[PDB]
Design a protein around this ligand. Structure first.
Ligand code: BNI
Ligand code: BNI
Ligand code: BNI
Ligand code: BNI
Lengths: 121, 123, 121, 123
């Protein structure tokens, strides 16, 4: 529906997702930055029964940076909300964790925020 | 990847995390929280590195849970991001972001941040 | 210098700061949202000797939401960087912690991001 | 506010946090980290609620440290945000954001996030 489609964030990354009736999110992610290449599988969940007011729809998805081409031994999870309308938007904040030794654990997680704009005409 | 990830885990709050790890990187299972606007199990989905590095690094992973089942809907979603550490006392160290569906006016206070540690030992 | 002055974020909040030679930041903050009113004291620290390349200047500051008018029993810390030039900017990500009982501790911290634009002509 | 905040604290990493709490809400002291690009003490400044609620809520506080002294400059700053809990075994539970000075091209990977727990007991 509103979430299903093709999106892009401020970095130029590509986000193609499909929203299922049971609240499931599946698709592929293509990052424009970092030790990444081509498409990576993504999986998430969303509130399939949001508030009818002016509230956004809570959702989230994960991407392990490993495919048949590269492995950055890391995973990112995006958490945010879908805001519908003429100009659909997905505002997120993310956590990127890397696999590290017990000694380097304190510096294993980066935090950021991505804003997605919908395309798919 | 000798993933001992599969199994039933518990966090410091007493929440029950049940997961199965697929050979290709998929994570699936149910989540039951001991705190907050929730009851019974909620479906969760995630991904993990099905080929961690040879050194002694943990296995990166993450998963999400929209807080809605047949009993309630807290109009929220939580994503956990972290790493699995195998061994005698296996553990999953994570940090999470909980986003609530809100109006544009309240978007600034829509996301909580925390951290949970899961072990295979009772709450 | 570059940091010293008056700033505003996307929410309409007011940030008046002075950068000291020893890396100290002092000033007042006025929030446009939340259980807040008037001016609150702020204190921070910044990298007083940044890289001469195109890097930003690392900095941070804290505000306890308590003054002679209100007390929201909370404190926010902003962490980010100052990016100079014609259009000065301060990109931050913040953590807002509230005082809570041990039972409600898991939901004591909100996270967000504020972008500041400089004014003081 | 019976602030037992003042004193020397240590975190799970072995870092030493020394602070003095002013009657009006100010926090000042030095910070020494056992990990990372750092050595010796670094000046820190912060604020805390000098009038917490009457119930059993913790005392909200926060502080910053730019990582530059006479020995090194890691071109970074860390802010800790959390709450003080008094009692037999006093503790300061916090979460932090570490921002590195970077170019616009690397801004997306400039901030690390974690959490530290400070107690008055040796490392
Ligand atoms: O490079 C890797 C994998 C690609 C990460 C892309 C990130 S996901 C959040 C943000 N949104 C995007 O669309 N793209 C970026 N990961 C990685 C990064 C840093 C470190 N590190 O140690 O700093 C280790 C692995
Ligand atoms: O209560 C709800 C749903 C359940 C959330 C459980 C959280 S998931 C992170 C942490 N780890 C656990 O095992 N359990 C907790 N969500 C919610 C919470 C707060 C707000 N709020 O506005 O503050 C809105 C919705
Ligand atoms: O309302 C209060 C105090 C004012 C907070 C202003 C925040 S600081 C980050 C952001 N940037 C701004 O310029 N303004 C906002 N705090 C508070 C908020 C929420 C809760 N809560 O429980 O949800 C408790 C206390
Ligand atoms: O090494 C530096 C300076 C020292 C940082 C100490 C951190 S403060 C949070 C945590 N709590 C502690 O007590 N100690 C650690 N900073 C730095 C670290 C990583 C990167 N990086 O790019 O990954 C850049 C600068």
């Amino acid at each position: 529906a509103g979430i299903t489609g093709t999106w892009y964030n401020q970095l130029g990354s590509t986000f193609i997702v499909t929203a299922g009736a049971d609240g499931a999110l599946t698709g592929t992610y293509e990052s424009a930055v970092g030790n990444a290449e081509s498409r990576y599988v993504l999986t998430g969940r969303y509130d399939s029964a949001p508030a009818t007011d002016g509230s956004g729809t809570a959702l989230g998805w994960t991407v392990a940076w490993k495919n048949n081409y590269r492995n950055a031994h890391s995973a990112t999870t995006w958490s945010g909300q879908y805001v519908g309308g003429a100009e659909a938007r997905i505002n997120t904040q993310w956590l990127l964790t890397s696999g590290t030794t017990e000694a380097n654990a304190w510096k294993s997680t980066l935090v950021g925020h991505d804003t997605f704009t919908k395309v798919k005409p």
